[PDB]
Amino acid sequence: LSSEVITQVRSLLNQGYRIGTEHADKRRFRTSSWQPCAPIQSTNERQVLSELENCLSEHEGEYVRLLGIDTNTRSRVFEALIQRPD
Amino acid sequence: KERRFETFSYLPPLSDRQIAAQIEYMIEQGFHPLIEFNEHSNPEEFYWTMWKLPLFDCKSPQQVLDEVRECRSEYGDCYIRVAGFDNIKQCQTVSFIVHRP
Amino acid sequence: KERRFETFSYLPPLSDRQIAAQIEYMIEQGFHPLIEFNEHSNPEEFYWTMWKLPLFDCKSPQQVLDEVRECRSEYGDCYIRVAGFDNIKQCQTVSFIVHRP
Amino acid sequence: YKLTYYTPDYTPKDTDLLAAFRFSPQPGVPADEAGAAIAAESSTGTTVWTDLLTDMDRYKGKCYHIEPVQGEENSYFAFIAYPLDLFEEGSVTNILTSIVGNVFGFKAIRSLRLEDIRFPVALVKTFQGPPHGIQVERDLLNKYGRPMLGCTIKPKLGLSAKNYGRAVYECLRGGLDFTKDDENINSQPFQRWRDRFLFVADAIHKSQAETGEIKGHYLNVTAPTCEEMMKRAEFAKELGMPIIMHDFLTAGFTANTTLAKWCRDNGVLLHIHRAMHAVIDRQRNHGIHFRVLAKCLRLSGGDHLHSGTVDKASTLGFVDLMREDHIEADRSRGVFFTQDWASMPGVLPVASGGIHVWHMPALVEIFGDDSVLQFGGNAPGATANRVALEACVQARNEGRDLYREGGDILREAGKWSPELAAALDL
Amino acid sequence: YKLTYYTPDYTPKDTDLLAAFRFSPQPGVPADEAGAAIAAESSTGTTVWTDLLTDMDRYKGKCYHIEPVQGEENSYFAFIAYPLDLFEEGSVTNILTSIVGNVFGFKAIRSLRLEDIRFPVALVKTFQGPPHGIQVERDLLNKYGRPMLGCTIKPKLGLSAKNYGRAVYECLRGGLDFTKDDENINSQPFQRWRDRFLFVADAIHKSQAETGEIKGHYLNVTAPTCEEMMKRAEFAKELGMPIIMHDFLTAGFTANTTLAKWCRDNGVLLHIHRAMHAVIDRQRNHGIHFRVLAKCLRLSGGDHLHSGTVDKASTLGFVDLMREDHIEADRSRGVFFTQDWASMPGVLPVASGGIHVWHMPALVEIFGDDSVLQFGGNAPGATANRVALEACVQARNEGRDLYREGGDILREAGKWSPELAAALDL
Amino acid sequence: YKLTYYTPDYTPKDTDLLAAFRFSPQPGVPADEAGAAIAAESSTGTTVWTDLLTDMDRYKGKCYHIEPVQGEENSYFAFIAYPLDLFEEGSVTNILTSIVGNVFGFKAIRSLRLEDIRFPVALVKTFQGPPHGIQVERDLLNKYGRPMLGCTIKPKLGLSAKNYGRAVYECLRGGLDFTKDDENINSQPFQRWRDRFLFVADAIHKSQAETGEIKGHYLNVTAPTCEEMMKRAEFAKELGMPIIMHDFLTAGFTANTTLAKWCRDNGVLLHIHRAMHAVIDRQRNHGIHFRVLAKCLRLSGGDHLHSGTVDKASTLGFVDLMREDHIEADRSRGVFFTQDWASMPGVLPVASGGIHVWHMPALVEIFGDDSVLQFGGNAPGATANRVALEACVQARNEGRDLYREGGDILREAGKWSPELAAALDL
Amino acid sequence: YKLTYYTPDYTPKDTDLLAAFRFSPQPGVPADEAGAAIAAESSTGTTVWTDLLTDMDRYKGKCYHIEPVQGEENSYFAFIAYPLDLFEEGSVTNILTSIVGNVFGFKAIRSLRLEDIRFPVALVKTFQGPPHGIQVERDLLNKYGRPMLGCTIKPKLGLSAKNYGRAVYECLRGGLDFTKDDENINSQPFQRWRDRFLFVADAIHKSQAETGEIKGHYLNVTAPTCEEMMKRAEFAKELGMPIIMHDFLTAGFTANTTLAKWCRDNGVLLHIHRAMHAVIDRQRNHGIHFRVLAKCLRLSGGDHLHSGTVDKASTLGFVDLMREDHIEADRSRGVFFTQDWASMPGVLPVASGGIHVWHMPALVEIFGDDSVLQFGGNAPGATANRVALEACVQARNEGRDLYREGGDILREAGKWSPELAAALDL
């Protein structure tokens, strides 16, 4: 994980937002096609970071996008493209 | 007489090897083949008659060739064409001739 | 004869106290006074003549009151309307009469 | 199915359409499965060779959240997001057809009721909206600072166009802003519409002239056909008639949109009646809650709407919904999702059903000047009602609590108002 | 109330209109007063000075007889009489506006349930009705001594206009009579209606060349506005399409009747989808029953009508109502009222829903030849569907009882036909 | 000024329109003030009484960042955001009018240079867009897997319409997908359009007959008047012409958008020419960038668009913008912002200016099959061009590198192709 | 190249169109060869078998005069002849496409401009020209002896249509003959066009009845599409509106020309707005100088045109080119050619940009009684500005030197005018 991503996920978790991740190959990524990833059910920074790194490793050479979710509202509050195939 | 066809028509009639190459390329770009035909060839007549299935669970070109052989064994006097569809871009991406009477 | 005015004209002729209290509550919600005058009141006539500026820097209704003295005193045979404008909601929320001939 | 249409970790994009479905599944079906099915019918129905030509994913409906209903048993809310690609732009009809065209017909659910839609901003901009809106309505009418007054002609049938116009005249001249056709009246043998129109138009003209106040009557243009409805609207125009009426839910949403277009272009104020609505909304346990119909109407376009005679919280919720350009999500008033109407004008709410002019201070406090009050008819009565309106408007306008002093203001008003003194006697 | 609107002894005029109401009053209210009120809110509502300038007597909703429902408690059937003059001529919208405009919102009823009307022969006679009718459609299309076959295109959305037409062609050459739009598809961004219609038209033409049987596809024309519907319909006709498709509840009854007129003048067959009908019929205590909607539509006009996959009693009753010229009252099949239609042409029923060709012989048994069967799909499967249909018809003709022999019949049919044999393997 | 328009910490909303302005403030003008000033010019300009009847808040343009340009002096990229509500829906003319209507004349800035805009999704959904899109284009034209060929008639002036067809015919039969009008050639006194229409159309028809491939020419419709432009338009329709051409810079955008609407209604491909552009774009320190115009165009609607013979990196930038549904920000390729289009179909690139086919393997590499190629004129030459194209397509799909191996491919194609052998021999 | 596109000794024919160009070529290319090329790509581009079937030599753009720019290095002025047959009768768009369509892209020029054209009398004729011009506009407005006076309506955006008509009323009752839209206003969602037009219309009728002198407001009809744009022109005509607005760069030529014909056919004055005007002509080295645009406009048609704020000598040049019907070739005024205009009626120029009422003596001694002097705001200010105008008009007419006596006259005017006294106070 990059520092800038680390500092983003810290900021997201500080506010109480939940973390989710979505993955897609280069052709689906072209067409704004994303798929659900393994749910990160953990509020601790360390465990979140670890599960994100594991999910990145899961889907090597595919687009990965990180997002901020407010459970109460159930609405998205941040969009961020974290990883690219190259 | 001079009748031509849409793609690759000005090349020499594709050899089985060349057809395989083209199918191969289709596979690696994930566009499963569709085989279709008609006893005539009209540019206005957009559609053609599909060869009883599109081969989505395609792993090798040699299956698509073998399909083509069955079609000419039954319709050897009929033009035959193979198509590739990009379900993600929602576009037909291949269309060329493999047989003529 | 029976000519009537669009807002409040079913109630008794607005006394100085009543107009003052109308303005007072108008300003409680940030509305700044407007004054316009016309010799007639026609239902088709949206617009009247403006009283040489709108009083955007209002602090007390009394200034608008003495303004309306003077509008009278120069246009005492003409109708006098007061208004307020919701620049936030972009809605006009007051328009009523204070003077008749 | 849940594995395909339940994505609990999905969160909707701002460009999705979110539909809240209240459901009481049939015994044996878990609630999660039931919400996956709901998501399934309206966004897929359901294999076939054609399936894989397309990317299924893009065109799926996700129920991203399921909860039970507080204080109810066997009850849950499904919140389902919809890709913007699914619906034609500017077509309420298509939206309804996709969401509720066949999910209602399903078997596993014992009862389903659509609660609310959160139409994405982008999808809102594809609908012109109310032809004028509240503000343009106020400007065209040049009336300010008070809720409007509407009355219906009675009896609903039998009056001659000449006698009917008589009635309309007496009602206007006594001090009502507005009169209205009954929803039933379109061309009955006893009253043909064109003679109705010419009578009543001349009555409004004469009430105008005498009052000096722009007057309005709601002329129905609900007609058997599109072309007919075009002629009645045209003929209303040509008489200078400042407003018309339609019965959207009977006639149609597409006809209503059509009317929206015509009137907008011709600058004609539109009123919308709300006939049949109880066939869908009456039952808290099934059908569609009316707020959906309201939001669909204002997407279709209409400057007025019956808001009922008055749950008061859900009233306020959806009334706000159909006035305020932005609403926040809140379940006490019923609002399921935050919605942004992108600066789009709201619609005027209309109160009817025996507004009981002694309750008028209640309504005025409820709803505010941005609201219309309809009586459900003689000149003194209409004067009295108008006086009272004005008297209560002044009282809140000096700062008085309407609630507690409504009776006191009435008595005050009636002291200097004979006609209102007599109406109070009533 | 009861003193004026309850007339238990009145016998209804041929020229009255009769409405069937099952209903549960609120506790305390007697049944008679409940029916009286029902009638009032539909007719006159409620005194004013204008009341007695008409022959008040003339324009009632006369609740003229009542009963409890057998085997249920606090539920009572009301029949109410309606003079013919109450209604404009040719306006489905108007008839529904007064019957059910506001009575469903009447408070004292626990639940209300509109079940039937008997349209007086006069009131029938003013509607155009179906553009062509069953017989004239069969004469057009040449399809005789059997029901017709339809397959809905799947997946409902995603398919390219080119693929969509490819699927059409498959389905049609395999032998289906027709192919239909999903009700939802009107202009979705991934399919622009015009390119869809061109594709479809060229595909039908080329299938019809192949096959030598009339092919047509049920092209949806439901649009956000009237002008868009008229355009799409003009286009359709410019290509020689024989039929279109419309969604009368969602779009509306006025827009529907417009379309029925335009088709009558343009020679174009009309298909009706009943999307949303569930929102009005599904519950057994509230809403307007599908049969009434069927009356109202065939009065409006349409050549097809979905009627469910298939209570079997009710189904068989209201399909006969919408088929036959004269039917007789039968409470067992739901037909309350005796209705005559003065020879006005019928409509073809449509049944859909994954209809399990194993069960099709049941369907021919139920429905008879003048019907259409739709299936929710490749060329071989359509050929298997067609051969089974033709076998079944032959067998029914011969004498073999369909209910007891259907499986066997499908046996022999499949023995010589491979596509049918494979389908039956499934 | 700077105290207000410059809102460094301001987070853009999804509902704002974002603009990138490279500008050179006059010496002594601070950059920050320059960016405030540019934000005012295109939002509000500048107090008078009326200023406070409006909430200025809602309708200011907000400069939320400034940066200095790397490797350049005194030049700074400005990014400004606007609320959506400044814009009439579906008016690119209004886009331009507000962004660029006065900023360019601003006296504090030595040079102002628009680069990039972001359209929010909602403002997208208001435009129709290209009449058919890539895929629907390819579907109507029934060619796949390859980019298309285009030749321009020469000499641009003096060829009699008979002759001019005769040239068209030789171009097409030799195996070009398309011929084209030249931007200038509209009804010249030596070439009246009507007769030109008639002869060219008949030439396509007979070529289509001989060759059996769908041939089309790009028929200019830019006309002095809206109504002229129409009549030209219909009469191209009546001849079945599948495609036309319009110069829209010279003509504007409102006329172009009409034309896109007409064509979408009538099924007609709309080629775009892109003349008068170097008047705006070529200069690198002042003017509007071709990607912006291309955005704007396609929002208006158009099937083809020139992108240049080929900075290759900016070319890839705007090409990938004007074709793909989603693109990501790339300052290396000139895409400031991140854009989304919600499945709105893209537009086909066209390259012209002496394509010089011995470089064609490069062009196929650069652009991909979704593109069109213009040649800057006999039947063998066109044959050679086509043979090369097909050979290079084949080679690329064979996995052979186009770049490295162009010359070898072209030799092997020429060995069996005398007409390509001769063409290479030049 | 030179040998065919360089004709130094060629005296142009009377009928020739001449276009003056300023250019700076690439290192290496001599000026003459750049001139031959610039000639070339505008007419003939470049050989093909279709060549000797044409008379090339006839339609060649001949460069018959090259000179260096005095006191400048690497710059020169070119004159090139272009047979009248080269452009389409009465088509502005096509001349700009031809002359300026791609010539800006020719790599061999570092920078180019179009500086002037000579529109020959014969090519002048064809264009419909201004709908009304100066003398007819003065007739239609009954004003003579002084230049007209306008204010711009501020703030540019945020008003309610009622408020914007208010403002307009106050500016017109101020003493300005005219008022205007802001170019950034056609249909903004918070304030729609139809409300605006009705309001402003009412406001003018009230102004006219109040003063008894012609009163008016420049209304904006610029649209997304031609059809709504006709509809705006029609609606404006329907209200007795004198004059409208257009944005001839953002909607282009064929749009304004449509409006020019339509106006001439409708007796409704036309204004031309110049949004984006700085994009093209602003720099000193490149683009097209603004008088070409002005002249092209005069051809296409518009009553009014912005001229900015005010170099001077060229200013007067193109001002004259757009007022007098023969202007001698005058270098120092940037009039490169003599322009016989065929009696073509002139255009009233419009000067705007904070006209700084103190400076009108210089303005209107620059621009004359035949000029429109538009101001960028209450009644007293406008009355003062009319005072000053009338004072200065009298003072010239009776013999006073304005350039020197402007302060004296202004003060003298202000002595009896308290409103112009309050205005000189500020």
Q: DSSP strand E in F291-382: where?
A: 304-306, 326-327, 339-340, 348-351, 372-375
Which residue out of C47, C50, C51, C56 would a mutagenesis test of the F interface target, given it has the greatest number of F Cβ atoms within 10 Å? C56
Put simply, the chain D residues between 231 and 250 with a CB less than 8 A from any chain E CB are 247-248, 250
Question: Cβ contact (<8 Å) for F279 and G278?
Answer: no
Instruction: Find tokens 């066209």 and name the residue.
Output: F350
Looking at the DSSP bridge assignments, the partners of residue F81 are F18, F62
C-alpha distances out from residue F307 to E136, F141, F176, F367, Å: 57, 21, 19, 10
Taking a C-beta distance cutoff of 8 angstroms, is the pair E401, E395 a contact? no
What is the residue-wise DSSP string for G345-398? ---EEEE-S---GGGHHHHHHHH-SS-EEEE---HHHHHHHHHHHHHHHHHHHH
**Measured between CB atoms, does G58 come within 8 Å of chain F?**
yes
Question: Cβ contact (<8 Å) for F343 and E190?
Answer: yes
Coil, helix or strand for E143? coil
- How far apart, in whole angstroms, are the C-alpha atoms of residue F287 and residue B71? 60
Is F125 annotated in a binding site? The answer is: no
**B91 to chain F: nearest residue by CA?**
F135
| Choice among E273, E277, E289, E304 that is catalytic | E273
**Measured between CB atoms, does F342 come within 8 Å of chain E?**
yes
C-alpha atoms less than 13 angstroms from C-alpha of D183 in its C-beta half-sphere: 30
For residue C61, say if its preceding peptide bond is cis, omega within 30 degrees of 0: no
- How far apart, in whole angstroms, are the C-alpha atoms of residue G364 and residue G147? 8
What is the maximal distance between C-alpha atoms in chain F?
82
To one decimal place, what's the resolution in Å?
3.5
Which candidate, G354, G424, G425, G353, places its Cα nearest to that of G388? Answer: G424
Is F256 annotated in a binding site? The answer is: no
Q: F393: distance to nearest CA of chain A, Å?
A: 21
Taking a C-beta distance cutoff of 8 angstroms, is the pair D12, D65 a contact? no
What is the SS3 assignment for D6-18? ECCCCCCCCCCEE
Burial of F108 from C-beta contacts in 10 A (0-12 / 13-18 / 19+): middle
For G9, phi then psi, to 5°, come to: -95, 0
Which residue out of F325, F327, F339 would a mutagenesis test of the A interface target, given it has the greatest number of A Cβ atoms within 10 Å? F325
Taking a C-beta distance cutoff of 8 angstroms, is the pair E262, E294 a contact? no
What is the residue-wise DSSP string for D15-84? TSEEEEEEEEEPTTS-HHHHHHHHHHHHHT----GGGGGS-TGGG--EEEEEEEPTT-SS-EEEEEEE-G
Q: B38: distance to nearest CA of chain E, Å?
A: 11
Which candidate, E302, E352, E260, E364, places its Cα nearest to that of E137? Answer: E302
- How far apart, in whole angstroms, are the C-alpha atoms of residue F18 and residue E217? 46
Contacts of E228 (CB under 8 A, 6+ apart): none
Neighbour subunits, G (≥3 Cβ pairs < 8 A) = C, D, F
Which candidate, G277, G197, G296, places its Cα nearest to that of G244? Answer: G197
- How far apart, in whole angstroms, are the C-alpha atoms of residue B92 and residue E162? 9
**Measured between CB atoms, does C52 come within 8 Å of chain G?**
yes
Q: Which uninterrupted H or E stretch holds F416?
A: helix F402-416
Question: Cβ contact (<8 Å) for A30 and F328?
Answer: no
- The DSSP 8-state label assigned to residue D274 in this structure reads -
C-alpha distances out from residue D84 to D61, D288, D338, Å: 11, 22, 17
- How far apart, in whole angstroms, are the C-alpha atoms of residue G18 and residue G34? 17
- How far apart, in whole angstroms, are the C-alpha atoms of residue G347 and residue G135? 9
In the residue annotation, F154 being an active-site residue is answered as yes
Instruction: Find tokens 């309206």 and name the residue.
Output: D42
- How far apart, in whole angstroms, are the C-alpha atoms of residue A8 and residue F328? 20
Which candidate, D152, D150, D301, D176, places its Cα nearest to that of E101? Answer: D152
**Measured between CB atoms, does C35 come within 8 Å of chain D?**
no
Looking at the DSSP bridge assignments, the partners of residue G377 are none
- How far apart, in whole angstroms, are the C-alpha atoms of residue C49 and residue G215? 16
Taking a C-beta distance cutoff of 8 angstroms, is the pair G275, G221 a contact? no
Taking a C-beta distance cutoff of 8 angstroms, is the pair G203, G162 a contact? no
Looking at the DSSP bridge assignments, the partners of residue B97 are B81
**D84 to chain F: nearest residue by CA?**
F342
| Chain B residues with CB-CB distance to D52 below 8 A | 32, 56, 87
Which residue out of B46, B49, B55, B85 would a mutagenesis test of the E interface target, given it has the greatest number of E Cβ atoms within 10 Å? B46
**G163 to chain D: nearest residue by CA?**
D139
- How far apart, in whole angstroms, are the C-alpha atoms of residue E192 and residue D173? 53
Contacts of E31 (CB under 8 A, 6+ apart): E25, E66, E68, E76
Q: First vs last Cα of chain C: how many Å apart? A: 13
| Chain D residues with CB-CB distance to B85 below 8 A | 53
| Tokens found for residue A27 | 């052709």
Question: Cβ contact (<8 Å) for D393 and C7?
Answer: yes
CA angle D365–D369–D375, rounded 5-degree value = 80
- How far apart, in whole angstroms, are the C-alpha atoms of residue F391 and residue B8? 8
What distance lies between CA D265 and its chain's CA centroid? 21
For D127, phi then psi, to 5°, come to: -120, 130
What is the SS3 assignment for F1-59? CHHHHECCCCCCCCCEEEEEEEEEECCCCCHHHHHHHHHHHCCCCCCCHHHHHCCHHHH
- How far apart, in whole angstroms, are the C-alpha atoms of residue F413 and residue F417? 6
Taking a C-beta distance cutoff of 8 angstroms, is the pair D233, D263 a contact? yes
Is E274 annotated in a binding site? The answer is: yes
Facing D11 at nearest CB: one of A28, A39, A69: A69
Question: Cβ contact (<8 Å) for B54 and D54?
Answer: no
Is F250 annotated in a binding site? The answer is: no
For G223, phi then psi, to 5°, come to: -135, 165
Q: Which amino acid does the sequence have at D36? A: A
| Tokens found for residue F45 | 């300009």
| Choice among D60, D65, D132, D273 that is catalytic | D273
- How far apart, in whole angstroms, are the C-alpha atoms of residue F280 and residue G249? 12
Which residue out of A31, A32, A35 would a mutagenesis test of the B interface target, given it has the greatest number of B Cβ atoms within 10 Å? A31
Taking a C-beta distance cutoff of 8 angstroms, is the pair F254, F265 a contact? no
Is D333 annotated in a binding site? The answer is: no
Neighbours of D116 (CB within 10 A): 26
Which candidate, B31, B33, B40, B32, places its Cα nearest to that of B5? Answer: B40
Give the method of determination.
cryo-EM
Pairing of β F16-25 and β F76-83: antiparallel
| Tokens found for residue F60 | 């200011």
Q: DSSP strand E in G39-156: where?
A: 62-68, 76-82, 109-118, 148-152
Q: Which uninterrupted H or E stretch holds D248?
A: helix D248-251
Contacts of F138 (CB under 8 A, 6+ apart): B91, B92, F144
- The DSSP 8-state label assigned to residue E123 in this structure reads H
Taking a C-beta distance cutoff of 8 angstroms, is the pair A48, A82 a contact? no
Helices (H), chain C: 16-28, 61-74
Coil, helix or strand for E421? helix
| Chain G residues with CB-CB distance to F100 below 8 A | 275-276, 279
| Chain E residues with CB-CB distance to F345 below 8 A | 189
C-alpha distances out from residue F224 to D396, F156, F228, G43, Å: 62, 20, 7, 20
For G242, phi then psi, to 5°, come to: -65, -40
Looking at the DSSP bridge assignments, the partners of residue F265 are none
What is the residue-wise DSSP string for E207-267? HHHHH-S--EEEEE---SSHHHHHHHHHHHHHTT--EEEEEHHHHBHHHHHHHHHHHHHHT
What is the residue-wise DSSP string for F155-186? SSS---HHHHHHHHHHHHHTT-SEEE--TT-S
| Chain F residues with CB-CB distance to G86 below 8 A | 157, 188
Instruction: Find tokens 């286009």 and name the residue.
Output: E235
Q: First vs last Cα of chain G: how many Å apart? A: 63
